[PDB]
Amino acid sequence: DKLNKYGRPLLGCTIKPKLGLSAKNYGRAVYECLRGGLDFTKDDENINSQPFQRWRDRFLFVADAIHKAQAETGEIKGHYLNVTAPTCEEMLKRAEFAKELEMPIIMHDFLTAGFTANTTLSKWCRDNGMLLHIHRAMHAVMDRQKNHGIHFRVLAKC
Amino acid sequence: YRLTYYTPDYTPKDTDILAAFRVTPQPGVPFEEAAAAVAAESSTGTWTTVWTDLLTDLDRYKGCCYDIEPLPGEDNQFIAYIAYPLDLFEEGSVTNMLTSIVGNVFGFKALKALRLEDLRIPVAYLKTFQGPPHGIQVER
Amino acid sequence: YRLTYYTPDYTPKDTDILAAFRVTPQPGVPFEEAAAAVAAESSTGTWTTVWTDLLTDLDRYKGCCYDIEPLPGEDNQFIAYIAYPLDLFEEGSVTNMLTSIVGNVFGFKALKALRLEDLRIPVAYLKTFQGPPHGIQVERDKLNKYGRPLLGCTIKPKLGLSAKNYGRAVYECLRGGLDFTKDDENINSQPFQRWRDRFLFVADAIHKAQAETGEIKGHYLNVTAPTCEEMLKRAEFAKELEMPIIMHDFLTAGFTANTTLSKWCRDNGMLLHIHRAMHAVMDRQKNHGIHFRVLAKCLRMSGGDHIHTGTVVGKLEGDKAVTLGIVDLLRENYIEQDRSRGIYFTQDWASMPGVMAVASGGIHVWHMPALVDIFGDDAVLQFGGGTLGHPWGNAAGATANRVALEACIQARNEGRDLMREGGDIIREAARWSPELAAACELWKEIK
Amino acid sequence: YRLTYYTPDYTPKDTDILAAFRVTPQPGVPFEEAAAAVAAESSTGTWTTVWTDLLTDLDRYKGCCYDIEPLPGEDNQFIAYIAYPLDLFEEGSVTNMLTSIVGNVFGFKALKALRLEDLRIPVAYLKTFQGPPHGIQVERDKLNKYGRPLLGCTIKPKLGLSAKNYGRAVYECLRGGLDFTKDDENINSQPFQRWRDRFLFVADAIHKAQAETGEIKGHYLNVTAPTCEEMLKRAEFAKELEMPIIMHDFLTAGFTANTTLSKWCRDNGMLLHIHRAMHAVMDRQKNHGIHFRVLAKCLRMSGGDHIHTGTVVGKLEGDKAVTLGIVDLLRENYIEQDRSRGIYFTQDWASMPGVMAVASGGIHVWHMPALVDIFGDDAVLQFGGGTLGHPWGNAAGATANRVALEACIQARNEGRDLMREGGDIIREAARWSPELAAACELWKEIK
Amino acid sequence: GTKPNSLVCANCEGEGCVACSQCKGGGVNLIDHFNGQFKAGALCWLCRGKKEVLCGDCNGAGFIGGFLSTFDE
Amino acid sequence: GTKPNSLVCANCEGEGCVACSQCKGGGVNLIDHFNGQFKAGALCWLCRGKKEVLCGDCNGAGFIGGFLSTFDE
Amino acid sequence: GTKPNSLVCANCEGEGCVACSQCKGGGVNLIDHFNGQFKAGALCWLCRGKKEVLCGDCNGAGFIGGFLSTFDE
Ligand SMILES: [Zn+2]
Ligand SMILES: [Zn+2]
Ligand SMILES: [Zn+2]
Ligand SMILES: [Zn+2]
Ligand SMILES: [Zn+2]
Ligand SMILES: [Zn+2]
């Protein structure tokens, strides 16, 4: 309903491996992928905020890419902006700036950040009308080996 | 073919993050290839310059295996010693360090198993972390 | 008596902070005694182990002179290189770095004079600072201006104008083709012009000039203030008006106030231009004070997106080379040690972003080809009289400056020598630009 | 050519800000041109009406040299007296005042050197400033201490100690007889000692020492920080522990940060000790920079309850009289113009409260009579080695200093001459005090 | 995917690209395509003169087993 | 810039402007400047009747050494 | 304070401490002191057995002109 997309799966593209690009060059890639007909794009899970690319700059140019692509196609576009962060404070600070740029969706690494962080962000997303794309980095540490650990179906339930 | 992600001539910088992975590769997979792939998979995901050429600073943000060390037993294990540059990681975020280093490789199908035995956390990266609230001395 | 604070076999650690002092000791004092005591005075305050022995870790948090280097003109001076361990300094604090190193030694009565020429900021310490809120790359993407230096204009001397009349001058320079205008550093908030009125009318000027030209404009609104609360309240209102850029006086306000604003600018996507009023009180005299290159490093660490570097037109030799060491020190990630340009230490910046160099002073259209050749793209050229003195007014002065710049950029890309064909390049453009032709009458070509 | 910016007829208005510059011009340049250029460069930037004519109120907001005074020393050195109108400056901002006056002129190429010796701060501008948070009178009331100077001790060099060990040293000095202890200026928050831990143990030392002696105790807790946020967070925690006093480094932190902290101190009832780290960078050299008396005036305006003035024991003639000129300028409400004490202008403070003068450095029990006579009651005597060096420990050293002070106060009340009978005063008290007797064997009497 | 006793991509042999099948390395159309929407002699319809395209089997990785070449889980 | 044993601007004698060289102080054109776009007799093409233009050596300061005339640093 | 053509403290020769003048190196009292308050043969009244005390001219710095050994300003 929020996206107005029915009777089909949605298409996405991970902008990967393009680690070390400028926020603007990263945002030119996002623009092209959406303009050409995909519904979503996705942040590299490794990208949070780093010397090569700070989060606020990435969020700004990604937002340009969506508005421009949404305009030219007439279809709702989105990009899972990665708010995974060192602290809950920093995570929500990022989520808020996504909400401030009118972005429909964000992403979060639930295992490396944790379930206390993720539940915080899940409630925030309910409160703010934000869609939440959950990435599962580090899952194979627990769920690969068939005799020890936690199967993914449990971590999917959780 | 020359493996650019296995450089045994490389001497780690003091700013590099170093990992020691106990790799259990699939039978038939040589140790050198396994180690270069573990380097790529915890990093750019590639050995080549195809995707990298379409970037600005190129393979600057890559991991590489600088040393291989076979281990006792008939499980065909070795230690892949791998170096990552300081710029890859968000300052003060354990979350991002684990995300970058252990995010994908543990599900790499060219291995049977894989274990992170140790990390050399460099001093420049440690200065971006608070560390313990107080610690031994202050607690006492 | 062995001097424990002069340790010439010590190899500096990569984590140490290294200082290079130009020491002018009292006549009769040997260089080694002076070097030891400068290490002691910038540190514990003692050579001995009397106070030290009363402590737990002892002489661990001490400076030590690890090298002496005499100079031609040699009764006077030497350079003492001193190393301090990383533990001495609070993380992310230029304030405490300066207090610890330069807090007392300058008043050391066994010296006639003393000057800190350079610091080596170690990578591990640099990672505790934010650095510039944006820096060169990130700025250019925010402004959408590439392949050329940016052009600016100080509205000065126009002290005493209405905020609206000031705004009118701002509009005209920007509309005429400059990228930026600048607040008078003396203008914060006064009876003749209150700050909130200036911000309003400068904003109208920006929106209007940007709308008509289709190019992003900015004005370095001065948020320098009596208090941190007032500094931020002024920054916030610039943000409320959707201003791309503000300015701050980092010395007269101070590093504690500046680091605060640097953080706030990162947090709110605001470009930060740094003015350096009062620098000459410290950096002018060649035997005493702190060289500007140290202040420039401190500012890069504290945070600024632009900074005034010193302006040079000549043959890049001697004191002109000093200025370009500073420029490299501000913009590059890795600057090799090079004594002919005053770079005493190799400085790794470890991806802390570079700062735009601001060339300012009495510049004009004839200086354009030289400036483009010397500074390259990552610079801001601030015109004073060179824009405002144009006899058809402010917009026409700007148009002349913009036309001169684009002519130099096209010639550079063609392969031409900007230095020796600079006169030809301007005159060729002045055939096709009445505004440039008028500028070329007021100001005289340089040999 | 008539020089409009040199007007020897001009009588300063009582609202003008007046500066006294010791100008060392380039040889050949006549004094009147130099005087007029300094007046312009610290102001509009021009002699002419060219830029002026393109404004509303024209040359109203200009400085002008109103007097020249050649000096005998060296020749090519004169005092230019310059007047600036009240409308130039922002209300309550030392930052803007310094920016306006000293922002550019020190870089002026037609001079070799330049020094700002004094400023006349007008009564009408002073009332825009808070001034000290408390000052002399109000401080003595909070502490309940009268008829004597205050004794203090700098916990230095003890860099590397635990919060707890550092606090044990504070406990002993306070318990032994001192009123105050002082943080090492180099200690803010470091790996070896984090600020919150220090503040806690210092608070334990105070409450305990205060409980045992029955006299109010204080320790100047260093809130100097990277950011205003961190500065105030530390000040807030000192308030939370019910500490009566904190310290701040005003030059390395900056005036903008310092004016914020001074306002916070007034609002929360906190005494504010101002340390002056790095001052020598500007105030050492006699021909270039800013004399401390200007920085001391600025600090009284921005605000502080204690400030370091320099320490003197001798005949109060020449360089020693300059030091007492500064003391009067910080303490008194009205200071008569007096060139023999470096007081270039009469200064009316308009009831802005006075600041306690801190005498520091290598002082010891034998200096006590001299220090009482020269500085009087409204002063803090900060001991370094003079307390901590005592062979029986910190408490005994503190006792030796207190007994020496109490001796001098009683001698003073009896009509004795503290200057010629100082040695006798101390030796007499040494009969009764074994701690003082022990101190008198370490340090030597002055002739 | 892989070569024998190896994890290198057999199709490109660790290069990440292959020669363009359409123009056979020439960089030009040998025949017309799509009823002459792309004409013979002009820049190759597929590669546009670059004479190589991405290897599909490894998606430029040069090896098989990783996220870029293999399915999830 | 300066006169002998002085800091006053030599080009303008401390006045900050000079006589306009195109109209020669009269405030009127003398030649058909630029193809008679600014024709002779009328308003000066350069100064536009103001008979004076900014001094190029000091940019209106009337003296050399200061920020308005000299390079930074 | 300083030695000839030098900045090392003359009183201690840069050690920052001197011999205790009361016990004269011995560490024990020779005469009574303070009207029999500290007896002969007991621990030294000044140095308490340590045999050295801080050098008063430099306050343990070893050198003259620094903050530890000099008046402020
Ligand atoms: Zn392949
Ligand atoms: Zn092809
Ligand atoms: Zn002139
Ligand atoms: Zn004319
Ligand atoms: Zn000594
Ligand atoms: Zn003894």
JSON list of C-alpha atoms in Angstrom, two decimals, chain F residues 8-42:
[
{"chain": "F", "resi": 8, "resn": "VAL", "atom": "CA", "xyz": [51.89, 56.30, 0.80]},
{"chain": "F", "resi": 9, "resn": "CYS", "atom": "CA", "xyz": [50.79, 54.97, -2.60]},
{"chain": "F", "resi": 10, "resn": "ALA", "atom": "CA", "xyz": [52.87, 56.61, -5.35]},
{"chain": "F", "resi": 11, "resn": "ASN", "atom": "CA", "xyz": [50.48, 55.95, -8.26]},
{"chain": "F", "resi": 12, "resn": "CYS", "atom": "CA", "xyz": [47.65, 57.96, -6.58]},
{"chain": "F", "resi": 13, "resn": "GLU", "atom": "CA", "xyz": [49.68, 60.06, -4.05]},
{"chain": "F", "resi": 14, "resn": "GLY", "atom": "CA", "xyz": [47.54, 58.68, -1.19]},
{"chain": "F", "resi": 15, "resn": "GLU", "atom": "CA", "xyz": [44.17, 59.64, -2.77]},
{"chain": "F", "resi": 16, "resn": "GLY", "atom": "CA", "xyz": [43.14, 56.05, -3.67]},
{"chain": "F", "resi": 17, "resn": "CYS", "atom": "CA", "xyz": [41.92, 56.91, -7.17]},
{"chain": "F", "resi": 18, "resn": "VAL", "atom": "CA", "xyz": [43.52, 58.34, -10.29]},
{"chain": "F", "resi": 19, "resn": "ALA", "atom": "CA", "xyz": [42.31, 60.32, -13.30]},
{"chain": "F", "resi": 20, "resn": "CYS", "atom": "CA", "xyz": [40.58, 58.01, -15.81]},
{"chain": "F", "resi": 21, "resn": "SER", "atom": "CA", "xyz": [43.02, 57.42, -18.68]},
{"chain": "F", "resi": 22, "resn": "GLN", "atom": "CA", "xyz": [40.32, 56.97, -21.39]},
{"chain": "F", "resi": 23, "resn": "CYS", "atom": "CA", "xyz": [38.46, 60.29, -20.89]},
{"chain": "F", "resi": 24, "resn": "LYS", "atom": "CA", "xyz": [41.62, 61.92, -19.40]},
{"chain": "F", "resi": 25, "resn": "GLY", "atom": "CA", "xyz": [39.58, 63.46, -16.54]},
{"chain": "F", "resi": 26, "resn": "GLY", "atom": "CA", "xyz": [36.98, 65.20, -18.76]},
{"chain": "F", "resi": 27, "resn": "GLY", "atom": "CA", "xyz": [34.29, 62.54, -18.26]},
{"chain": "F", "resi": 28, "resn": "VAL", "atom": "CA", "xyz": [33.68, 62.34, -22.03]},
{"chain": "F", "resi": 29, "resn": "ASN", "atom": "CA", "xyz": [34.86, 60.02, -24.81]},
{"chain": "F", "resi": 30, "resn": "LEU", "atom": "CA", "xyz": [37.34, 61.43, -27.36]},
{"chain": "F", "resi": 31, "resn": "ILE", "atom": "CA", "xyz": [37.58, 58.52, -29.89]},
{"chain": "F", "resi": 32, "resn": "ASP", "atom": "CA", "xyz": [34.94, 56.20, -31.44]},
{"chain": "F", "resi": 33, "resn": "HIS", "atom": "CA", "xyz": [35.76, 53.42, -28.96]},
{"chain": "F", "resi": 34, "resn": "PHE", "atom": "CA", "xyz": [34.90, 49.88, -30.05]},
{"chain": "F", "resi": 35, "resn": "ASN", "atom": "CA", "xyz": [33.39, 50.40, -33.54]},
{"chain": "F", "resi": 36, "resn": "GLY", "atom": "CA", "xyz": [31.23, 53.33, -32.33]},
{"chain": "F", "resi": 37, "resn": "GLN", "atom": "CA", "xyz": [29.35, 51.24, -29.75]},
{"chain": "F", "resi": 38, "resn": "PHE", "atom": "CA", "xyz": [30.65, 53.78, -27.29]},
{"chain": "F", "resi": 39, "resn": "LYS", "atom": "CA", "xyz": [30.86, 56.68, -29.78]},
{"chain": "F", "resi": 40, "resn": "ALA", "atom": "CA", "xyz": [33.00, 59.81, -29.25]},
{"chain": "F", "resi": 41, "resn": "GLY", "atom": "CA", "xyz": [31.75, 62.86, -27.32]},
{"chain": "F", "resi": 42, "resn": "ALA", "atom": "CA", "xyz": [29.27, 61.01, -25.03]}
]
